[PDB]
Design a protein around this motif. Sequence first.
Motif, short mmCIF file in Angstrom:
data_model
loop_
_atom_site.label_atom_id
_atom_site.label_comp_id
_atom_site.label_asym_id
_atom_site.label_seq_id
_atom_site.Cartn_x
_atom_site.Cartn_y
_atom_site.Cartn_z
N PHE A 143 0.68 -0.83 -0.13
CA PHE A 143 0.54 -0.06 0.01
C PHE A 143 0.51 1.26 -0.56
N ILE A 144 0.08 2.13 -0.21
CA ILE A 144 0.77 3.92 0.40
C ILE A 144 0.86 4.17 1.41
N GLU A 145 2.16 4.49 1.25
CA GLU A 145 2.19 5.30 3.11
C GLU A 145 1.89 6.93 2.42
N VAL A 146 1.12 8.02 2.88
CA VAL A 146 0.99 9.68 2.35
C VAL A 146 2.29 10.01 2.94
N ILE A 147 2.42 11.09 2.81
CA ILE A 147 3.33 11.95 3.86
C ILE A 147 3.52 13.14 3.42
N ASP A 148 2.24 13.32 2.24
CA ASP A 148 2.19 15.16 2.05
C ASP A 148 1.22 14.88 1.29
N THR A 149 -0.33 15.42 2.06
CA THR A 149 -1.66 15.39 0.92
C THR A 149 -1.45 17.37 0.55
N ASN A 150 -0.19 17.47 0.61
CA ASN A 150 -0.26 19.11 0.04
C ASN A 150 -1.60 20.08 -0.78
N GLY A 151 -2.36 20.35 -1.52
CA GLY A 151 -3.65 21.04 -1.72
C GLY A 151 -4.57 20.12 -1.05
N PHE A 152 -4.92 19.26 -0.82
CA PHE A 152 -5.62 18.25 -0.76
C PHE A 152 -6.08 18.11 1.10
N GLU A 153 -5.05 19.21 1.17
CA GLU A 153 -4.89 18.88 2.91
C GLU A 153 -6.30 19.69 3.41
N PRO A 154 -6.66 20.71 3.48
CA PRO A 154 -8.07 21.57 4.12
C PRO A 154 -9.31 20.04 3.30
N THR A 155 -9.74 19.49 2.22
CA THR A 155 -10.57 19.13 1.95
C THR A 155 -10.58 17.54 2.80
#
Length: 370
Positions: A143-155
């Motif tokens: 699976f994918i470990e996400v370290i940054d949601t960049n612009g998706f942050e707010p949502t």
Amino acid sequence: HLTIGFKVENAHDRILKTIKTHKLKNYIKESVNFLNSGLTKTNYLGSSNDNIELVDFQNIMFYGDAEVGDNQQPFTFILDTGSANLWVPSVKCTTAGCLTKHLYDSSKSRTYEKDGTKVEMTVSGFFSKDLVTVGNLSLPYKFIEVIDTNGFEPTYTASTFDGILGLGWKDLSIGSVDPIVVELKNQNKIENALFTFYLPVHDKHTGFLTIGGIEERFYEGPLTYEKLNHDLYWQITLDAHVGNIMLEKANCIVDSGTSAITVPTDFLNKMLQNLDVIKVPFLPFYVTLCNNSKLPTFEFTSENGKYTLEPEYYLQHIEDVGPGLCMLNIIGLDFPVPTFILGDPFMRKYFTVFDYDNHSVGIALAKKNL
């Protein structure tokens, strides 16, 4: 076969929340009374400016008993029929938003196996391998470990889930990892690389995902299979007829992740012409009297079947706004080619089978009472 239940937050839910939070009740009521009175030459159905965004009609499917590795906190996953992978926020994500989530910490999992292949779907992360558990099914999975949601942050920060469980098709751009349902079959943990959706017609906030097999209790009669017309989407070809207008061989995406039946804006405008349906100005929805006898029935046909969707399926009472008022779970959405998203409303009438091995969608009338 493994069947898991999930909760649903639909467009109607969020619309109600907004109306309540900003006391928009009278605005909507007064808007409807005025616009649906006939003082205007035609019934307002919105415009390029005052439109409805697909994000407003997301059908979020939450599942809270999935596990990734051991010695972890519980996770909340949403189902996404459009993604091939399992996405999990990493303890390495330390933004304010991530700190409000349940994060995956590989250093604490006994079964964790390093991979490290970077992912840049913006969103940044890397692949990791660990035991993933859904119901009574467990399998070592990448699976994918996400370290940054960049612009998706707010949502994301405003959302109430941690990760995404993909029920879509493998897309080599992100990786060569098979979707979890396919992998389960590869490891001979399930009988078939398929999953089904049974959305109880009587409870819009609930849904059931069955993995690996077809349970007869969910539907009536034999299934009719429709071949996918694309390698990466649960999309089939159907002729759509609504009233005296039609769209031949339209692409129809079957997606439990959409709260409405989406229709090309032009086609929707023609459909609703003088049918006493109005779009609430600047609010994400159309309204009409629940007893409106002019509402059309959707008719979708293929070489092997005919599927229809009567008004009862796309109407939902908005009693808190006004008595006898209903919002329509129909929105205008354009695609490069004539396309309909057969979302939740369609799936409340029809049981659906998503077959990876056979590249098709099986359809049959859903049993309303199990």
